[PDB]
Design a binder for this molecule. Structure first.
Ligand SMILES: C[N+](C)(C)[C@@H](Cc1cnc[nH]1)C(=O)O
Ligand SMILES: [Br-]
Ligand SMILES: [Cl-]
Ligand SMILES: [Mg+2]
Ligand SMILES: [Mg+2]
Ligand SMILES: [Mg+2]
Length: 430
């Protein structure tokens, strides 16, 4: 009696008995930030039912919704169990599954407060979720309102871009100041700048080591035909800057999940003011305070020879096999021998394998399980890298968020490696 609009309820007891079943898919339709652990309705335990997959109901407007579902391996032969903060928030998702040929769809009504409120009901969360902030958190922050996971009295919202002030001037978070990516990294090496330059640059942008820095960027459809495609990949640049600031010693760095798009999707006010900087005289800590976050070429070579270490290549497949360099300023094509490949996505300016279509980070369990299939696991010292370290920093950040204890960015990347003609490299399909 398949009813597209009337959905079977599943009880708490029934769901608890199915937690280990391989043919049940439990689907969390709340925002990815709530899934990660943010207690968006004041629940005492945040996160998701253990084993649940993330499928935010916001994505129902995506024309590729069904391909998102299929790529998550959610199949018509599965028993689908949907939950959100309320069963009403699941109704449109339940219908969309039934309209696309899924005949076994139930809704679980008692996730909150029944499941969240009882410590015998298993839940999971992204261990360092408080570094990956939702738009509502940033809005409360700049509004001077009490927000969770924030006990500081000093903050700065920083809009990152690579030589493209228009990315900021065309629309930004109220009160934010822009930080060009060249302020923290050198155009000669495309590595992080020296400690003296970083100190000066951070001070001139109004940042101290005890300032809470909220970083975001704007995705503006990077095109390889342009001279600087990176000028349109603002949110990768933001995570790259988060890497450098955390290396330098900013103790509390946050990243807005999904970048500028999350802010406008949440309906918040846009500003076009060119906000002047409020400089500070003293950064307030030795730079770098966290040198272990950065790996340079000599240590990278050692890691290729150690059993407990790996370099992780976060480049595209055409870069991997030496078909393209990836960049209009890199001539050499190939790959570092001995690195573990973790395909970023389609090219140097897209991170589709680490992101959702709305640019929020991919469900971390999926990233975790793919990495584990290649032997990328938390018990190793891992140095993520890419062409010059932007994509590598975004991979690194994702592992940092899972609480992995020895993750780093090999800053130099393929740019530095291939610039020494004495360094071995491989090419072609392996
Ligand atoms: C280091 N720059 C800013 C020159 C890179 C940054 C980058 C973006 N996606 C991969 N790398 C570039 O824009 O090519
Ligand atoms: Br981006
Ligand atoms: Cl039915
Ligand atoms: Mg299951
Ligand atoms: Mg670099
Ligand atoms: Mg090794």
């Amino acid at each position: 009696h398949k009813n597209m609009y009337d959905h079977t309820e599943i009880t708490t007891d029934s769901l608890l008995a199915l937690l280990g079943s391989e043919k049940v898919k439990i689907i969390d339709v709340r925002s990815a930030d709530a899934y990660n652990g943010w207690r968006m309705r004041g629940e005492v335990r945040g996160g998701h039912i253990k084993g649940a997959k993330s499928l935010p109901a916001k994505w129902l407007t995506d024309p590729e919704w069904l391909n998102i579902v299929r790529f998550k391996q959610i199949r018509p032969e599965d028993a689908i169990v949907l939950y959100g903060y309320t069963p009403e928030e699941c109704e449109q998702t339940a219908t969309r599954f039934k309209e696309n040929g899924y005949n076994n769809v139930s809704v679980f009504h008692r996730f909150h407060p029944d499941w969240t409120g009882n410590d015998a009901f298993p839940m999971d969360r992204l261990e360092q979720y408080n570094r990956l902030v939702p738009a509502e958190w940033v809005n409360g922050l700049i509004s001077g309102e009490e927000i969770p996971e924030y006990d500081n009295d000093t903050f700065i919202v920083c809009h990152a871009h690579y030589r493209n002030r228009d990315a900021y001037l065309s629309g930004h978070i109220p009160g934010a100041t822009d930080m060009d990516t060249l302020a923290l990294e050198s155009p000669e090496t495309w590595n992080r700048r020296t400690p003296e330059e970083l100190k000066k640059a951070l001070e001139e942008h109004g940042i101290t080591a005890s300032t809470t820095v909220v970083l975001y960027g704007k995705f503006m459809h990077p095109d390889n035909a342009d001279e600087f495609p990176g000028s349109a990949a603002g949110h990768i640049g933001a995570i790259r800057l988060a890497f450098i600031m955390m290396y330098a010693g900013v103790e509390d760095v946050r990243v807005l999940n999904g970048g500028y798009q999350s802010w406008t999707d949440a309906g918040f006010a846009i500003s076009k003011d060119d906000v002047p900087k409020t400089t500070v005289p003293e950064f307030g800590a030795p730079i770098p305070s966290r040198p272990e976050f950065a790996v340079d070429i000599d240590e990278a070579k050692e890691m290729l020879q150690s059993e407990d270490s790996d370099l992780v290549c976060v480049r595209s497949y055409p870069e991997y096999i030496g078909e393209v360099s990836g960049y209009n300023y890199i001539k050499k094509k190939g790959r570092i021998p001995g690195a573990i490949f973790a395909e970023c996505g389609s090219d140097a300016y897209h991170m589709e394998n680490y992101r959702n279509h709305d640019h929020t980070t991919r469900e971390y369990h999926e990233i975790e399980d793919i990495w584990a299939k290649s032997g990328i696991i938390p018990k190793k010292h891992l140095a993520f890298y890419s062409g010059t370290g932007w994509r590598g920093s975004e991979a690194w950040f994702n592992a940092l968020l899972m609480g992995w204890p020895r993750v780093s960015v090999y800053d130099g990347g393929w740019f530095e490696w291939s610039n020494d003609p004495e360094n071995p490299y491989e090419t072609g399909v392996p």
